[PDB]
């Protein structure tokens, strides 16, 4: 959860009203044992604007 | 600097002759007798315990308790 705590006022006047925004990050991983034919079929498809897919290999 | 930060041989006798009838004996008890400062008062406690007069019923620092021997 990415918190950002800030006064609302651009200036300084008034009671000290604070305000905190958050940005929540959800990170999954799914481990697959597959050949090259599916993984490349599955990387082009299932794209989604706003879901960052990352595919790594190498148990090392 | 107010009376009895030392041994004062007569005072040793005082302790041996006065601890009887002490239902409660502790650090604050030994000083209250116009007598030993707290440091050497704390040394008497393990001494009068070396044999007899006092029975250790409390345990630790910041509070001691002894009682007439029976």
């Amino acid at each position: 959860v990415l918190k950002i705590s800030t006064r609302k006022t651009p200036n300084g006047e008034g009671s000290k009203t604070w305000e905190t925004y958050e940005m929540r990050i959800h990170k999954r991983y799914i481990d697959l044992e597959a050949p090259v034919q599916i993984v490349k079929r599955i990387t082009q498809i299932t794209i989604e604007p706003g879901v960052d897919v990352e595919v790594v290999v190498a148990s090392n | 600097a107010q009376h009895a930060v030392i041994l004062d041989q007569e005072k040793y006798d005082r302790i041996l002759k006065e601890v009887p009838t002490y239902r409660y004996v502790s650090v604050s008890v030994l000083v209250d007798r116009l007598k030993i400062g707290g440091s050497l008062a704390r040394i008497a406690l393990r001494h009068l315990e070396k044999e007899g007069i006092i029975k250790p019923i409390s345990k630790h620092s910041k509070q001691a308790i002894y009682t007439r021997a029976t």
């Binding site: 009671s15 000290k16 009203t17 604070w18 | -």
Partner: protein, 141 residues
């Protein structure tokens, strides 16, 4: 693989996990006998489940507990809970019900919250004070 259950206990944020396997009556806390739990004035708080329910009842079991989180008091109130919740979880699967319901009866009639986990929890502070209810000082000029 013998008769065995695992149970937990949660005070403020401490959790005390406790596996109850059939054995010859030992009770360890993270590595050590229940006779060394010391902040030590509360020692009879974690003995308490043993004495409410009689010093027997353990000769056929071994209890081990490890507490992560909390603090020098919150952990002590969580182990007793997992110890008693586990002694009553063991009579769930292995001994019969009537023995078990006698145990819930003899704890809850004393119950420093021994089977029931205390819902109290730190309230979130809000801007304007060092506390959650407390406010900063003001002056009116």
């Amino acid at each position: 693989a013998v008769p065995s259950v695992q149970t937990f206990g949660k005070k403020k944020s401490a959790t005390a996990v406790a596996h109850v396997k059939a054995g010859k009556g030992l009770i360890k806390v993270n590595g050590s006998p229940i006779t060394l739990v010391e902040p030590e004035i509360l020692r009879f708080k974690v003995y308490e489940p043993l004495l409410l329910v009689g010093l027997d009842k353990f000769s056929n079991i071994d209890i081990r507990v490890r507490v992560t989180g909390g603090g020098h008091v919150s952990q002590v109130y969580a182990i007793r809970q997992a110890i008693a919740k586990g002694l009553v979880a063991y009579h769930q699967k292995y001994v019969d019900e009537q023995s078990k319901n006698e145990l819930k009866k003899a704890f809850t009639s004393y119950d420093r919250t021994l089977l029931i986990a205390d819902s109290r929890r730190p309230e979130p502070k809000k801007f304007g004070g060092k506390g959650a209810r407390s406010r900063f000082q003001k002056s009116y000029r």
